[PDB]
Amino acid sequence: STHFDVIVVGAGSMGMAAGYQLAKQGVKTLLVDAFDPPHTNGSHHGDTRIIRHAYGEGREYVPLALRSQELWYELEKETHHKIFTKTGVLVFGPKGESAFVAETMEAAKEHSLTVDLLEGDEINKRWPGITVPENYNAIFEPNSGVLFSENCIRAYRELAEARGAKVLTHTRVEDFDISPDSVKIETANGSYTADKLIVSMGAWNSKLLSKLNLDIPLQPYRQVVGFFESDESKYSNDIDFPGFMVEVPNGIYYGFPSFGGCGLMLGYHTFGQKIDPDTINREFGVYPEDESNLRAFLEEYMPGANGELKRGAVCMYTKTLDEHFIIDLHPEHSNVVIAAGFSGHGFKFSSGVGEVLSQLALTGKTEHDISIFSINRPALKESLQ
Template identity: 60%
Template sequence: MNTDYDVIVVGAGSMGMAASYYLTRQGAKTLMIDAFDPPHANGSHHGETRIIRHAYGEGREYVPLAIRAQTLWDELQEEADETIFEKTGVLGFGPEGSAFIDEAIASSKEYSLSLDLLDADEINERWPGIQLPKGYKGCFEPESGVLYSENCIRAYRQLAEKNNATLLTNTPVMNIETYEDGVSVHTENGTFTSKKLVISAGAWNGKILSNLGLDLPLQPTRQTVTWFDSDPSLYDAGAFPSFFVDMPMGVYYGFPGLDDYGLKIGRFDVGQKTEPAYVNREYGIFPNDEGDVREFLETYMPEAAGKLNHGRACIFTRTPDEHFIVDLHPQHSHIAIAAGFSGHGFKFASVIGEILSQLALDGHTEHDISIFSLSRPELQQPKIPIK
């Protein structure tokens, strides 16, 4: 079939925008289609910052991808007019026996990553803003830090467009037709054809993929992050790291003060089930929007539990095992899919973009993505309950 483009990317958020950049670097005539105008506040990339860790508690299979992602973020920093990465270091802590902390430590040893192992007293002394009881331990990764997420999307957009990619904003996809040698993507603003397709539509993936014969256990959840007034001498960048915490009371993550809003914190392991068209993005409508994280701070970082400065709601899309989906469509090998990033995917957006460009153009990738396969047994299981 005669086509308008080499590749169409449906969903130009974190993964889709990165994929578009790497596609254009290989000379592919690329069309990006997004229902909004990225970067925007309707997906999973807004809120200014995301943590990047290399020693990975979610599984050591992620470490090579995290290292490659960091290399690509550093390259983007060289090309972009935006601040992409800031090396704050990342501290993880929890009680003795935390499987998450143990796996982060094991992954650092397997890949010879720089990681300081600390007990509770050492953490309390090094960062006086933390008060841990006996029986807790932690690990500090000095080479990790913060990605400025909206800057990342903006930089990839600017560079992709500089490489002659076309971006259609505020253009929802109505339907996708597949053929043996291409696709037609129907939108309110016209129909476009291409040889290859990348689908990376975040919380909207479930509906789009269902129309292409894939009924996947993807569960969007509403999540919140909160900024608290906090003592800058204790909690601003330079004095305090980014952090992730595996506690009996929950799993938390946060950032030092990087702006006038103060310390930023969110809870990972809870969220209200939702659908993207109906998610309530008003912060404070549920007591736990602030209550969970304030309780955590009052217990372990009491000097950070000042007045609420700001709060935002966003959306995760979880898989049952909280591993990503990155694969080719089983019936249509010219369609590459990126979905289900489960709240910990943004740090990998650079390398996932590279992978998607390789899958789309070559039908395979140099990276090991077997953990993200569509055929893994966990995707055949019912959707996991969300607290």
């Protein structure tokens, strides 16, 4: 008996950003979440996320990253919660052997991004505590950095609610009923209707998009991070130790300097367990690889950051087959917007994605170029159910 203008299902990284954008414009919005964001059951916890701009994954990503960066600076000004610290982001790998490094370097050139290029011992000299072989090269982006991701969602929620958005917590959406002129969601706490729907359920998109007659390969992965006791004279943000994402022969790792003595945090990017979001084991350390894959990197490349484990977390990626996002209207329903498959690299864009989703919901179009995120693209291996 309350009709909304827009309902957002899944008020996490993408949905809460969309909620803020909609509320800002006086759009009557309901956000429904299975938990109470920010929380520790989805893809947004573990405190910190890298934002970088030299995005070799595709041209379309660079302006989205730069717009998102400006939106994060705006958010910083709007809230009391801490949003962004400009740690810089270091990318390294073996010379001539890392597509990730090469693509990052190409992206910086193509978009005239401000970066430093260094190699071998220059890396170890600039950032004491890093020990790479002489045949490694690097590209450092001084103006990118680290987002406090739980703070971001909390701030967007507070601002959205202040403007009149309603947030229904601890409420799982179980089904959808879509009409030419309205949308309906079904939950154990009641059913709700609106003119438009945004669907942004994170790892649960892989289970519930079938309720919208969609059959899209989406695989959730269990991805752990650990915080380690570190040499603070080397690895502290206070001594300019950078965020990093790097490629070594056995994969990609990412991490964060120690903030206020929390310890250096590390994740292994290219490996995780295939899981179901409803049965995933969210306890860190239950597989020996959780800790050992991290320490194998640290002892080789960041040896003074390989101390006692201070904290672990268990988070999820949701991968598409091509590892590009899905941001598009539902092919059968122009009043339904889908945001899915962020493939372990979506958080930095979540501010810009909130803007895109807002535009798609209200106008059926966006000013951003999102062509590479089309739900109809062949590399998805997608169709209707």
